Amino acid sequence: AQYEDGKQYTTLEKPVAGAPQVLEFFSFFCPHCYQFEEVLHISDNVKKKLPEGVKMTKYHVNFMGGDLGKDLTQAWAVAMALGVEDKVTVPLFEGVQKTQTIRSASDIRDVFINAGIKGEEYDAAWNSFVVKSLVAQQEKAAADVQLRGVPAMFVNGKYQLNPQGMDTSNMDVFVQQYADTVKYLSEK
Numbered sequence: 001a002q003y004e005d006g007k008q009y010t011t012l013e014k015p016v017a018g019a020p021q022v023l024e025f026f027s028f029f030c031p032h033c034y035q036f037e038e039v040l041h042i043s044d045n046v047k048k049k050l051p052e053g054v055k056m057t058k059y060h061v062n063f064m065g066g067d068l069g070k071d072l073t074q075a076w077a078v079a080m081a082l083g084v085e086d087k088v089t090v091p092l093f094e095g096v097q098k099t100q101t102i103r104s105a106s107d108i109r110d111v112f113i114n115a116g117i118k119g120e121e122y123d124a125a126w127n128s129f130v131v132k133s134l135v136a137q138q139e140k141a142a143a144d145v146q147l148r149g150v151p152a153m154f155v156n157g158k159y160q161l162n163p164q165g166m167d168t169s170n171m172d173v174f175v176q177q178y179a180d181t182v183k184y185l186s187e188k
Contacts, residue, residue, distance in 0.1 A: 007165045012158050016144045019157025020057035022050065024181065028096045029073050030150045037093055038173050049179045056187060058085075059138040061150055065096075065180070071105045072096075074124060077100045077134035078112070078125045087115040118167035155185040 005011050008015045024043060026033040036042040045058055060076035062069050062121040072092070079085045095102035102108055112122050125131055145154060167178045 003181065003184050004165050007162065008177070009155075009159045009162050009185060012145065012154075016154075016157035017155065019143070019144070021054045021156055022046065022056045023141060023154045023157070023158045024056070024058040025061050025147055025152040025154075026029050026058065026148050027064040027069065028092050028102075029069060031097065034093050034097050035150045037089060038150050039157065040171060042153075042175060042178060044056055044185055045175050046153075046182045051183070051186060053072045057141075061142050062148065063148070064138065067124070068103070068108075070104075073124070073138055074131065074135055075105075075108045075112070077131045077138065078122065080134055080172060081125050081128070082121070082129055084112070084115065087117075088112055091115065114118060116181075144182055153182065155182060159185045159188070161185075 003009070026036070043056065043058060050056070060073040062073050065072065075092070076085075076086075079088050088111055091114065092102070092108070095107065095111055102111070109119075109122060109126075113119060144157075145152075145160070151163075155161070161178065161181060163174075163178060166174055166181075168174050
């Protein structure tokens, strides 16, 4: 066929019921994730090709960057709760990988302050049980698919994107192939 299991995607031996339709995992410590966000805009191009009605979910993971990795999963929970993902994603990536000015929870917090979230609102979110359960959800979703690598994308809890099997000579062609594959899997 044109799309083949084990080629542009793999199938989960252990499908995950009730999973989000399009589920993306990343880490701010993850170098391909930085590319995916800032150079390729994967999430965005996937959304542009997804059917009407399908919702898109993105979670941070703990298994990179030790203690700071967990702070970043909690900070991402804060971003989701406040709905400020689109204002902190770039400075978090650049703070961790480019300028390396993020070294502590307080540095993560500075990024939110600079993006205009108020201190009191940030600290209130950070400490909230709603954020605690949002962290729980991020962990559980990754646990459900026994996740050991990022970036990763899963469609309907049964298919996992496999970018290793796509031409990388052209970055645009790569992105469209990726997005088209998500759409195909979505319609499966």
